[PDB]
Design a protein around this motif. Structure first.
Motif, short mmCIF file in Angstrom:
data_model
loop_
_atom_site.label_atom_id
_atom_site.label_comp_id
_atom_site.label_asym_id
_atom_site.label_seq_id
_atom_site.Cartn_x
_atom_site.Cartn_y
_atom_site.Cartn_z
N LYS A 205 3.79 -25.39 6.04
CA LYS A 205 2.49 -24.73 6.07
C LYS A 205 1.73 -25.27 7.28
N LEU B 64 9.89 -24.69 4.07
CA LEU B 64 8.79 -23.91 4.61
C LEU B 64 7.62 -24.84 4.91
N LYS C 287 7.53 -18.92 -2.36
CA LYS C 287 6.24 -19.35 -1.83
C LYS C 287 5.64 -18.31 -0.90
N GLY C 288 6.44 -17.80 0.03
CA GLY C 288 5.95 -16.80 0.96
C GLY C 288 7.02 -16.45 1.98
N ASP D 158 11.45 -23.70 -0.83
CA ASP D 158 11.41 -22.32 -1.27
C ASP D 158 12.63 -22.04 -2.13
N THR E 242 -3.73 -19.87 7.54
CA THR E 242 -2.57 -20.58 7.03
C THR E 242 -1.33 -19.72 7.21
N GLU E 243 -0.30 -20.28 7.84
CA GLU E 243 0.96 -19.59 8.06
C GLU E 243 2.10 -20.44 7.52
N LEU E 244 3.21 -19.78 7.20
CA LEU E 244 4.39 -20.44 6.66
C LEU E 244 5.53 -20.27 7.66
N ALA F 93 8.76 -16.18 5.41
CA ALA F 93 8.81 -17.04 6.60
C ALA F 93 8.66 -16.17 7.84
N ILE G 44 5.35 -29.61 4.02
CA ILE G 44 6.55 -28.79 3.88
C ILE G 44 6.88 -28.67 2.41
#
Ligand code: MG
Ligand code: MG
Ligand code: MG
Ligand code: MG
Ligand code: MG
Ligand code: MG
Ligand code: MG
Ligand code: MG
Ligand code: MG
Ligand code: MG
Ligand code: MG
Ligand code: MG
Ligand code: MG
Ligand code: MG
Ligand code: MG
Ligand code: MG
Ligand code: MG
Ligand code: MG
Ligand code: MG
Ligand code: MG
Ligand code: MG
Ligand code: MG
Ligand code: MG
Ligand code: MG
Ligand code: MG
Ligand code: MG
Ligand code: MG
Ligand code: MG
Ligand code: MG
Ligand code: MG
Ligand code: MG
Ligand code: MG
Ligand code: MG
Ligand code: MG
Ligand code: MG
Ligand code: MG
Ligand code: MG
Ligand code: MG
Ligand code: MG
Ligand code: MG
Ligand code: MG
Ligand code: MG
Ligand code: MG
Ligand code: MG
Ligand code: MG
Ligand code: MG
Ligand code: MG
Ligand code: MG
Ligand code: MG
Ligand code: MG
Ligand code: MG
Ligand code: MG
Ligand code: MG
Ligand code: MG
Ligand code: MG
Ligand code: MG
Ligand code: MG
Ligand code: MG
Ligand code: MG
Ligand code: MG
Ligand code: MG
Ligand code: MG
Ligand code: MG
Ligand code: MG
Ligand code: MG
Ligand code: MG
Ligand code: MG
Ligand code: MG
Ligand code: MG
Ligand code: MG
Ligand code: MG
Ligand code: MG
Ligand code: MG
Ligand code: MG
Ligand code: MG
Ligand code: MG
Ligand code: MG
Ligand code: MG
Ligand code: MG
Ligand code: MG
Ligand code: MG
Ligand code: MG
Ligand code: MG
Ligand code: MG
Ligand code: MG
Ligand code: MG
Ligand code: MG
Ligand code: MG
Ligand code: MG
Ligand code: MG
Ligand code: MG
Ligand code: MG
Ligand code: MG
Ligand code: MG
Ligand code: MG
Ligand code: MG
Ligand code: MG
Ligand code: MG
Ligand code: MG
Ligand code: MG
Ligand code: MG
Ligand code: MG
Ligand code: MG
Ligand code: MG
Ligand code: MG
Ligand code: MG
Ligand code: MG
Ligand code: MG
Ligand code: MG
Ligand code: MG
Ligand code: MG
Ligand code: MG
Ligand code: MG
Ligand code: MG
Ligand code: MG
Length: 252
Positions: free
Chosen positions: A59, A57, A23-24, A50, A72-74, A26, A47
Motif C-alpha cells: 500500500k 501487495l 484486498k484489491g 493477497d 492510496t494505491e496497491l 494490483a 505490505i
RNA sequence: CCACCGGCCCGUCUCGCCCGCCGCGCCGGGGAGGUGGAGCACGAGCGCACGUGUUAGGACCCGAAAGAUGGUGAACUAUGCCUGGGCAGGGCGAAGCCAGAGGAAACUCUGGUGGAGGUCCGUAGCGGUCCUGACGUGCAAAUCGGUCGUCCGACCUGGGUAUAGGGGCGAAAGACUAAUCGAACCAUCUAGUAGCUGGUUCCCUCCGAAGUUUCCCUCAGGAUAGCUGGCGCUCUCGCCC
RNA sequence: AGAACUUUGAAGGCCGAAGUGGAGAAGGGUUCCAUGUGAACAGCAGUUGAACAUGGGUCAGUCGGUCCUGAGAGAUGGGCGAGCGCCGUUCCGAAGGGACGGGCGAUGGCCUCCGUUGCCCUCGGCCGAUCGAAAGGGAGUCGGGUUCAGAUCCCCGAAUC
RNA sequence: GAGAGUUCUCUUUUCUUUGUGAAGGGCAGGGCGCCCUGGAAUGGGUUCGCCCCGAGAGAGGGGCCCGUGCCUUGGAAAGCGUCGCACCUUUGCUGGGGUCCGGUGAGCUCUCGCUGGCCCUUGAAAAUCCGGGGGAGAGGGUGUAAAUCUCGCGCCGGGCCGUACCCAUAUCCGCAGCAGGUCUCCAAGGUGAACAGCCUCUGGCAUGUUGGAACAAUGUAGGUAAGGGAAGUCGGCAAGCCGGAUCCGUAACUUCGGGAUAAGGAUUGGCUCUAAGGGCUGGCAGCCGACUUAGAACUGGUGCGGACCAGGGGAAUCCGACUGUUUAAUUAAAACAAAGCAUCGCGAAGGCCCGCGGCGGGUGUUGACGCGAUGUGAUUUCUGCCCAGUGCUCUGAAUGUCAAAGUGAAGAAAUUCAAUGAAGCGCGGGUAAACGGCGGGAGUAACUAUGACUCUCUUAAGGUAGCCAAAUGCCUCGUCAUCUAAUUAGUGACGCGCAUGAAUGGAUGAACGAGAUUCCCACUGUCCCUACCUACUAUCCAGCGAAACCACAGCCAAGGGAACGGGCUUGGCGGAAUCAGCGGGGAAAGAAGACCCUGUUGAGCUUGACUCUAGUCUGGCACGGUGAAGAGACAUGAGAGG
RNA sequence: GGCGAGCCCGAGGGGCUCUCGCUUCUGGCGCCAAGCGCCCGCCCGGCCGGGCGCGACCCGCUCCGGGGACAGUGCCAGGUGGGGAGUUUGACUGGGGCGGUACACCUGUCAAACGGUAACGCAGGUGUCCUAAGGCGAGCUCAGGGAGGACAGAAACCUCCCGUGGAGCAGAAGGGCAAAAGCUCGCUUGAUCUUGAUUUUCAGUACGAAUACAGACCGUGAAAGCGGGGCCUCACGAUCCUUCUGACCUUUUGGGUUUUAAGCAGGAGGUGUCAGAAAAGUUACCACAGGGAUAACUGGCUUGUGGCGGCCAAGCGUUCAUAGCGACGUCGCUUUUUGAUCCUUCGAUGUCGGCUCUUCCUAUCAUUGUGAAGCAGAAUUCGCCAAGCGUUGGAUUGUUCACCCACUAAUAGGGAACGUGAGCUGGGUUUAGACCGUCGUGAGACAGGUUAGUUUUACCCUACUGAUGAUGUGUUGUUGCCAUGGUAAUCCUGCUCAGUACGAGAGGAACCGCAGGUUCAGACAUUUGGUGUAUGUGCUUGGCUGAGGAGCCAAUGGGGC
C-alpha cells in the motif's frame, strides 16, 4: 450428449473466482502531468498478503497534486522494499528498486517488472511472484522498445509505458512440494473450484470423448487441431511436437 | 341376349391418284389396305331412400418403448460462496532450549524440558465391513442388535445464496437433481402409431370353406387367383323323339 | 352403575446430568387453561386424553423484527430483441434538489429581537436507486411478587438509552 | 445454628438450607511494547516453554486500562426452612436465625489476559460513533457581563409488528400416538485417566397401541458343556483367546521417521506401617493442608482389571503409496481422488469456454513461479526400437486439384467458352511421457542334440532392460524343491511367454489397508454328537381384529391325452366338525420372461455408415476516406527478331 | 525567463542550431492566497465594508494516448465440423449369429412312363464370347486303328484301307447333326425397317426368350429356296430423370420471326435383395408389443455315440476252441453320458454343486445257501436264487468327475422334474463397480482369468406326525380277541479246534463251543460326566439403605461348589 467439465467452465455458475477476501486489484498509478513532466514521492504504509496470490501487495500513499487529499494505491511489492521507504513515480525519477518510470528512459539490460503493454495499461505484464522482464533495445525515432518476457518471448512495445524496477517478491515459491492433498486444497480454495481434476479416461463416453471402453485407454489421437468445436478440444491442443523435450524449444 | 363377318369415327404406317381456290402456296379436302381407342352402329340417365363392400377421417373397443411445445421444482441430494455452531479422555514423541560426561581438536553421547503431526487407541458426531443376523403383507416404500472405519480434520452441521432438464452438479458410481434419473415433474399435440395380445352382447332356418398359385425388404402381413354366399337373369320337360 | 389402565397414599424400579430433566430456533396453529358429556375417534377398556361442546388466554423505548451491508438478486441511462422481455449494475448518463456563509427582496411572533419564503455567489465524487441475516454488525432493565393459562411485557421498588 | 431420618447396639452421627441484581463510589487483583533517577560483562534478572536488555537490563519511584472480586446507596421493609395468634370463601400479622468463622485444589464449566505454534490456507464488508490537525468565523468589552459547555440537576415523548403451548420414542415431516429423520444452552455424587460402562441425588416415567394361565415343538436374543481342538464348511462364517496398569525384554526389514501395545514373561486384593515429594510467621524454630510414589510386615481355601471397562499373534504372496471419496435403497474395492512426474496452447485485437442477441459474459480484484486442456500416479533406479498408416504441426503464389465474385471472347440476347485462381486437399520435413506396433526360414561345439557364430525375404522397426504359469498360460491339475499321512491350493525356481513388458508405464517397495489368498501357535460346540437353562413369542383364554389368494374344489396306482391328471377309463377305495406342527404336492403367490427370437417398435453410446448444422478458417460485395512510390496485363503508333 | 549549459561569429553582443527549472540523506506539515496595481459607498481630503486583474502568461478545430482504412459488422461462396440433430442397420435359415445363396436365370436326376410337384436334396453352371463362331452356295469328311515310305524315334509329313458319329459344333450338361448343323473356300451384313397375333413361369399381368406370318428394301445360288443373329434348352431390367436419333411434325398462352424449353415414337445411362429404398456397429445401463410359430431346464419319440449282454469260433491259454478270454462278422436292452427333432411350458415350472432325509431298482462289492476252475490249503476268477442288511474318515478343487492317505467283511453302480432353494448354503455360473490378456479406430465383445455383489410369503386344501372326537351296540364302566397295516436286527475280532486237515516245503483252514466288539433299535438315570435361577449355600467388584447385622441394584453382576 452431456456437456463436459472443461466446457462447463465458461458458464461461470460455480467456477467463479473466490474474490471475497481479495484486498484489491494490483495496478499502477494513473499517468498524468505530475508523472510525465517530473516525479512524485509516496510513502509505503505496509505490505499485505493477497489470498490466491503469491506476490505481496504494498500500500503506497501519494499526495494528490490537485486536491488536498492522500491517494492510496496497491502496487505489487518488488523484492527489496520495506515499510517507510520513499517510492518515486515519474519520468525523471532516479533509477532504484521500487521506483516506476517509463521504459524509454531506462538503459538496456534493466531488470524490471509490472509493466504495461500500451501507455496507460496500468501494470499488466510480468505480475507473478518472482518474474521480471528484460529491456534489450531502444529506438529514439518511432519510439519502440524490445523486452524479453518471462516466457522467453521478445515483444516490441511502446516507449511511453512504465515499469517498476526490481523482481517481484516471493521468488522460488514453486520450490516447495505441496507434499499432500490438504495443502493443495487449501491453496485452490482461495483461487477457484478447479482442483479435483478427474481424468477423462476414467469417466464415461457421455461426459468426455476419452471415457469408455472395457480398458481404461484413450483410443483416439490426443493431439487435436485448432478447428475443433467446443467440447471436443481435449488432451493436447495443436501439439506441434510431443514427447520428452530434447534441449531448448526455441520457438517464437 | 350370345358368337362371327361386314360397315362408320378418331390417333398411326404403306401405296398411289383426284378435286377446290377471298387467292394457285413445304394451301386445304378425298381413297384403298394393317393396326391402337374407356368409341358409333335408334339413346337411359337423373334425383331421393335402403343394404352390402372398400377407403380417409381417433373410426369396433382397451393398450406402449418414444417425439415436440410451454411452464414448476437445489425444503432431499451434488457443488461453489457468505455468515454461525461443535469435536471427552490416553499413547508415540518433530523442531527449539538447558545441564552433565567423554575428547588434544573436530565433535559425540546421556538425562530432562519442549508439544509438531493431513499421527495412533478411543467418546459425542460422521458413514455403514461382517454376521450375507431379525424383520421381510415389518417399526420402517431400506429399519433394528452386536460387530465395525474415521474422530484437529481433504472434518461434521444449521441458515442465506448461485447454477434448471439434452440442462445443472459430479474426489467419476452415467451416481444426484423432492420415494421417479442411461435424460425430472406438470399440461397440451393425444382418442399419437402398432403387420402385435385381450374382448366384442337376442333366437330360429338355409348354404357353407381355406391353410393353396404368383408378386412384394416378402416369412406373425397384404395384393392376386382359387374355395364360399347372396342377388338375379336366359332357356328346357311337364301329352317312331 | 361400571376400575388393572383415572386420582391420592405407600412399597418396589427405570431414565442418572451426552436423561425418559429444565429451555429454545424451524415447523404445527389453538393443540395452552377451566368446566361438562361419554355414540364416533385413543388399534382392549376408560370416570382418562393432544377427541367432542362452551368459555378464557399471548400487555415491551431498554426481548427480537424494523437500521447496516456480506455471498447474491435487481430498475432507470444504454444495448439487444418480431415479442412478453432480456443481458448488463457502473458500463457509452446533463444520473448531488442538500448544506456553511454572504447579499437583495417579502412575510409572521411582544416587528427591540428572531423564525421562514423567493433569487444570486461560493463550496460540496455518487463509489450510483432498492432488496438481501428473528444465529453477522447494531445505544440502552434488573430484583421481588402476582394467574386456572403471561413475564426482563403486569404491580412494587431501583436504573438507564 | 434451624428443620428432618435411624437409634435392638454404636455414631457431637446422616440429610436440606445458611442472600445481595442493574446502576454509581472506593479498595484488593490482573495486564502494560507507559514515564523519571541511573547504566551493566565476573553478564543480568526471568518462563512450564520461550523470550528481553546500550534502540537502556537489574533496582528504586510513578502513570494508564479491565476491575464480572470485596464494602457501601440500592439492601432487608421484599425472598426462603423453622416453631405461632385470628381463620377455615374477611387469613394478615407476630421474633427470632439468616448479610456466621474459614481452608484447600494438575477438580469441571464460563470469562479475561500473556505467550507460542500452524501456511503456496492470512482468515468479511457496511451503517452509527469518536479523537486529532488545521483556524474560515462569533463573542461583552470590564470591578458590568456575553459568545459556548461532551459538567451536576429538572421537564416532555419514544409509534408499528410477534410474545400461549409442543420443540417430542405422543402437538414437526415420513398417509398414524410410526425403534426413522430434524439445529442449539445448562449440566451433580461414587468407582474410574475420562462427558467410557455401572450405581444414586434434583427432576420426570409407567416398560412404550392390551392383560390372565401354562412353560410343548419350532423360532428370536443370552451362557455354559466332560475327551479331542477346525477333523464341518468354498472359506476359523459365527463363536472363542488376549484385553487395564506397573517392572524387564522387544526380531526380519526400512525411506532410519517406523515396525511396536512386535513377539515373549513377573505382579495386581484387604488391613497396619515406614521414607520421600510443600507453604506461612521471627531475628536454625513454631503451625497449616492436597494425594502421589517406592519399600516392607501381617493375612484371606493363589483369590485379586474379582462387576463394568477391553488390541489374538506370527510367517508370506497379489493390489493400491498412505489420510480422504465412491454407487441414498444388493458392491466401500484392486475403483475414484491425491502430492509427485511429463506434455500441449496462450504476451490480452490472446488461450480455453458460456451465449438467440451486443466488441455481451467466466477464468479475470487474473499476466508465463499465471490461466486453460490431457496422460501416469509415494521414494530409488530405469523411460528400449519404430513417423510406414491413422492424428498434430511447419514451409516456398517452383509445383496438381480448386467455389462464389471479378476479366476477355463468340452470339441479337438468354447462354456458352477461355485466361487467372483463397482456404482446404495432394507433395515434403518434424514430433510416439500423440493414438499405436515390436515377424518368419536355413547351416554351424571332438558322444549327440540344444545350441557360441553366420546367410537370407518382409515392412517403419522385430520385445532391449525387466517380470511370470501372476488378477495376464488354451494345452494345464505345466516341470522341479518345500509345506501335508494325503494337496487341482500356497511359496521359490524354470521360461520361443496361444495372448507379459516399459508414463497403455515396467521392476521394487518401509508404514497403512472394515482389500483377496496360504500356513502355524493358543483358543473355543464349526464338528465328532448332541444335551440342558433363562427372557420374549409361539400355546389356551378376556377384549380388538385384517391381508395375500380364490373357475368349481381337493386320497392314490396304471393307460390314453397338449407326450408328467385332481376331475377322463380301469382298479385301490371312500363317514362329520376339528387342534398343534410340517413343508412333498396344488407344474402355490408375488410381475403381460430382465434370458433367446420377431417387430420394416423405440432409447443411450461410438465411428473413416447416409443427409444436415451451430461453431470455426478463408475469398468476394458495402460500411471504408485522402497521398506518394513501385510491379504485372489489356488497347494505342513506331523501331529490332524467327 | 539565464537564477542555466552551450557548438559558433564576435570589441560591446548576437541565436544558424538547443538542453528547460527548479519535489532524491530522513515513516513530519502542505487546500479554501500573501503581496502588488486599479475601481466603489462611507470618517474632509482619513477609517470601515466590497469588486477586477497580475500572481497562476497567449492562441487553437478532437479529453489524453495506441491502432486504423485494417481489425471487426451484415450478406454470399468454398473447406472442416458425431461438438450437436434426424434416420437405417436386407431376406432365407432344423433357435439366432457365423457359414452358404437354395434371393435372378439354365442342364440331368429327384419326379412315382402326359403336364405339374418340396427341402440349406444330388451332380453341375451363367452376368461372357463372336464382323464371325451370322446368312447363303459349293467342295470335302471326322476321332481312332491297321499295313508302308531318307534322316523319323510313341507323337513331324506323304499314300492305301477299316472307320453309324465312338470327333467336332465358343464355353456346364442334355437333345440333335454325315454329299450335315462338322472343316475349307467365294460374296455378304436379314445381327437392318414396320403393325399385329401366338408360345413359355402365368394372375394366363409384365419383362426376358422364342415361334409362324404379313407389308417395303437387300444378301446369296443358276434355281427351287434360306436368312429379320449364334442348331435348341439361360446368358439379362419397371416409374421418374438424363442423353441420342426422325419429322423440312405439335405447343411455347394478345398476334408474328428466331434461340431455348416442353411434346410423339425408339436406342442407351440402373435398380445382382435381379417385378426395381438411398443405409454402419454396440448396449452386461437397456425399454416396449408379442412368440413356446423360436434356443438355454425337465419330460416324451429313436439310440448314432456311451454303457451292458447273446450267437458263430479263427486263435490266446506249455498240450488242448469254449476253466478264463475270444478277433474277423452279427443280433439285442438302457436312458446313470452326449447328440438329433422342437411336442407341452415366454401374462416366469426359481436354472450348478454341497448339506439333511425317505423310498425304489440289480447289471451283487461284501455278507447267507450254492455250481465250475489251469480250485492241494489259503488267497482268487467265472455264474446261479438273491436288494434283507452295509457300502466310511480326510488332503486340493465351486465342482459332477478324477487323484492320493488311512481304515474296512466292502469301501459297487444308479433312479425319484439330471429327488430335494416358501429346507439351507451362494462356493461358481449369470446383471449393474472394477482389474488383466486378446480383438475392434471407437462404443464394446470374449463356453478367457480374478475380486464385492438383497435368496421374499403359508394363517388356506391335501399328504404326513401327534390329540380331541364321530358312527352302532338302550346308558356307562371293567376285563378282553385281532381283521388289518408296520416290522430289526446286521457285521466282525480273539481262544480251544490247530500249527491239525492239506501241502515236499513255504505256508495253512473248516463245523460245534467259549469271550466279546462295530452299526442300528427300545429305553434308563444307581453309578461317571453335562445342565443349572430351588436365584441352595458360602466368598467377591462398584453403588445404595447413617454405621455394624441384614440386604438390594448392575437387562439371570461375575465366578467356587
Ligand atoms: Mg484423478
Ligand atoms: Mg467408470
Ligand atoms: Mg462423445
Ligand atoms: Mg488396441
Ligand atoms: Mg394411447
Ligand atoms: Mg423420431
Ligand atoms: Mg423447456
Ligand atoms: Mg440446501
Ligand atoms: Mg488422526
Ligand atoms: Mg499401529
Ligand atoms: Mg464409533
Ligand atoms: Mg447398519
Ligand atoms: Mg445407511
Ligand atoms: Mg462387503
Ligand atoms: Mg440379511
Ligand atoms: Mg418371518
Ligand atoms: Mg469402533
Ligand atoms: Mg483399527
Ligand atoms: Mg483413528
Ligand atoms: Mg431432446
Ligand atoms: Mg430420487
Ligand atoms: Mg426428451
Ligand atoms: Mg382407440
Ligand atoms: Mg407368406
Ligand atoms: Mg361362385
Ligand atoms: Mg398411582
Ligand atoms: Mg434403584
Ligand atoms: Mg455438553
Ligand atoms: Mg436432551
Ligand atoms: Mg370429560
Ligand atoms: Mg379403543
Ligand atoms: Mg390440553
Ligand atoms: Mg377441539
Ligand atoms: Mg417499564
Ligand atoms: Mg433492538
Ligand atoms: Mg436486469
Ligand atoms: Mg431502454
Ligand atoms: Mg435491509
Ligand atoms: Mg420480577
Ligand atoms: Mg408459562
Ligand atoms: Mg456493582
Ligand atoms: Mg479456582
Ligand atoms: Mg414462551
Ligand atoms: Mg418417533
Ligand atoms: Mg428417534
Ligand atoms: Mg463423576
Ligand atoms: Mg479417584
Ligand atoms: Mg402396561
Ligand atoms: Mg408411543
Ligand atoms: Mg467342550
Ligand atoms: Mg473342557
Ligand atoms: Mg490345543
Ligand atoms: Mg491343523
Ligand atoms: Mg477349497
Ligand atoms: Mg467374526
Ligand atoms: Mg521371516
Ligand atoms: Mg509385525
Ligand atoms: Mg507417619
Ligand atoms: Mg487405498
Ligand atoms: Mg463427492
Ligand atoms: Mg455394502
Ligand atoms: Mg477473455
Ligand atoms: Mg511415482
Ligand atoms: Mg516408452
Ligand atoms: Mg513424416
Ligand atoms: Mg462472372
Ligand atoms: Mg553333431
Ligand atoms: Mg525377452
Ligand atoms: Mg513376485
Ligand atoms: Mg490347505
Ligand atoms: Mg502384447
Ligand atoms: Mg508378447
Ligand atoms: Mg470360557
Ligand atoms: Mg395319479
Ligand atoms: Mg412321467
Ligand atoms: Mg398320467
Ligand atoms: Mg390340477
Ligand atoms: Mg366323476
Ligand atoms: Mg369321456
Ligand atoms: Mg389345521
Ligand atoms: Mg412352516
Ligand atoms: Mg410376454
Ligand atoms: Mg417383415
Ligand atoms: Mg435409455
Ligand atoms: Mg485520438
Ligand atoms: Mg448420432
Ligand atoms: Mg431373420
Ligand atoms: Mg406321373
Ligand atoms: Mg412327368
Ligand atoms: Mg452344303
Ligand atoms: Mg454339349
Ligand atoms: Mg450325342
Ligand atoms: Mg418378307
Ligand atoms: Mg424379387
Ligand atoms: Mg442404434
Ligand atoms: Mg458402466
Ligand atoms: Mg413348440
Ligand atoms: Mg425344448
Ligand atoms: Mg411361480
Ligand atoms: Mg413350484
Ligand atoms: Mg433295503
Ligand atoms: Mg434337480
Ligand atoms: Mg462370486
Ligand atoms: Mg459383474
Ligand atoms: Mg509245518
Ligand atoms: Mg502233507
Ligand atoms: Mg437310539
Ligand atoms: Mg447324575
Ligand atoms: Mg454333576
Ligand atoms: Mg451360585
Ligand atoms: Mg460390596
Ligand atoms: Mg455388612
Ligand atoms: Mg441401564
Ligand atoms: Mg451365574
Ligand atoms: Mg459345576
Amino acid at each position: 450428449g452431456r456437456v463436459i467439465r472443461g466446457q462447463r467452465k465458461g458458464a461461470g455458475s460455480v467456477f467463479r473466482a473466490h474474490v471475497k477476501h481479495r484486498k484489491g486489484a494490483a495496478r499502477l498509478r494513473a499517468v498524468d502531468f505530475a508523472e510525465r513532466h517530473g516525479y512524485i514521492k509516496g510513502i509505503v504504509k505496509d505490505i499485505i498478503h493477497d489470498p490466491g496470490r503469491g506476490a505481496p501487495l504494498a500500500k503506497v500513499v501519494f499526495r494528490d497534486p490537485y486536491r488536498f487529499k492522500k491517494r492510496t494505491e496497491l502496487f505489487i511489492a518488488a523484492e527489496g522494499i520495506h515499510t517507510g521507504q520513499f517510492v518515486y513515480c515519474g519520468k525523471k525519477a532516479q533509477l532504484n528498486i521500487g521506483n516506476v518510470l517509463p521504459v524509454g528512459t531506462m538503459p538496456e539490460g534493466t531488470i524490471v517488472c509490472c509493466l504495461e503493454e500500451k501507455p496507460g495499461d496500468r501494470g499488466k505484464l510480468a505480475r507473478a511472484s518472482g518474474n521480471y522482464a528484460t529491456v534489450i533495445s531502444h529506438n529514439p525515432e518511432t519510439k519502440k522498445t524490445r523486452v524479453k518476457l518471462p516466457s522467453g518471448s521478445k515483444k516490441v512495445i511502446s516507449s511511453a509505458n512504465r515499469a517498476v524496477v526490481g523482481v517481484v517478491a516471493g521468488g522460488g515459491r514453486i520450490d516447495k512440494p505441496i507434499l499432500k492433498a490438504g495443502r493443495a486444497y487449501h491453496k485452490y480454495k482461495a483461487k477457484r473450484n478447479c482442483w479435483p481434476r478427474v481424468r477423462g479416461v476414467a469417466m464415461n463416453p457421455v461426459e468426455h470423448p476419452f471415457g469408455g471402453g472395457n480398458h481404461q485407454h484413450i483410443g483416439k489421437p490426443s493431439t487435436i487441431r485448432r478447428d475443433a468445436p467446443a467440447g471436443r478440444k481435449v488432451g493436447l491442443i495443436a501439439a506441434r511436437r510431443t514427447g520428452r523435450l530434447r534441449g531448448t524449444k526455441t520457438v517464437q
